[PDB]
Design a protein around this ligand. Structure first.
Ligand SMILES: OC[C@H]1O[C@@H](O[C@H]2[C@H](O)[C@@H](O)[C@@H](O)O[C@@H]2CO)[C@H](O)[C@@H](O)[C@@H]1O
Ligand SMILES: OC[C@H]1O[C@@H](O[C@H]2[C@H](O)[C@@H](O)[C@H](O)O[C@@H]2CO)[C@H](O)[C@@H](O)[C@@H]1O
Length: 213
């Protein structure tokens, strides 16, 4: 894949869609975690957004590699694709608007949603907003923020469970509180540091370029 896209931001605590077996041809699915942010060894645990006990892991959060490069995770809908083709794929995003214009973020797709448009990347960041389903309510009693778009100021990260706080702060620190920036993207091989956090690598990973830092 390459192309243009639209971004949003999210964190709903739900088990990511690519954390299920059988979504794509992968080494293993994305890890899910219990409510205490501990990895589950069983990939078939019911989502906490559907009455079960599996939630998004806190290490599947964004971080700065340097001022111009971040690594992280997204929920995606890729035009012409499906979960089979996007789950656990990585994409180098080059932002084309906002305060991050010209910076690069490499994201792994770990999920999707029915409210995502074509080539829309919902970039994961704690405090970006739960959206339709408040998984965080059952996980630990809820996060601060507007239901969509989440918190407004970095000081609100002081209210976040500790495992989520660094990803919350990244939104303000690296991402400069960019509001839904546009980007261009290219599918790339996943960096090893991203796979270490999700656990999931596509069988087709090496068919794509190494990303240009
Ligand atoms: O629905 C996709 C995601 O939306 C995120 O909120 C958006 C909102 O849809 C926009 O209209 C605008 O207000 O910007 C918000 C922040 O990107 C929401 O936080 C996510 O949970 C949704 O998955
Ligand atoms: O609830 C189980 C259901 O989850 C689906 O993924 C959800 C994801 O958990 C949620 O965060 C996002 O907003 O919506 C997606 C898509 O509904 C998953 O695709 C299903 O296989 C699973 O049964």
């Amino acid at each position: 894949a390459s192309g243009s896209g639209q971004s949003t931001r999210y964190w709903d605590c739900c088990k990511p869609s690519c954390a299920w077996p059988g979504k794509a041809a992968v080494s293993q699915p994305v890890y899910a975690c219990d409510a205490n942010f501990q990895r589950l060894s069983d990939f078939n645990v019911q989502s906490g957004c559907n009455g079960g006990s599996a939630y998004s892991c806190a290490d599947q959060t964004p971080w700065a590699v340097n001022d111009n490069l971040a690594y992280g995770f997204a929920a995606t809908s890729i035009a012409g694709g499906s979960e089979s083709s996007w789950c656990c794929a990585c994409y180098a995003l080059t932002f084309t608007s906002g305060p991050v214009a010209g910076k690069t973020m490499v994201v792994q797709s770990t999920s999707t949603g029915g409210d995502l448009g074509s080539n829309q990347f919902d970039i994961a960041m704690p405090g970006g907003g739960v959206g339709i389903f408040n998984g965080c309510s059952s996980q630990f009693g809820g996060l601060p923020g507007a239901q969509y778009g989440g918190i407004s100021s970095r000081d609100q990260c002081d209210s976040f469970p500790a495992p989520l706080k660094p990803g919350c702060q990244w939104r303000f620190d690296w991402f400069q509180n960019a509001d839904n920036p546009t980007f261009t993207f290219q599918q790339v091989q996943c960096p090893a540091e991203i796979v270490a956090r999700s656990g999931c690598k596509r069988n087709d990973d090496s068919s794509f370029p190494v990303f240009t830092p």
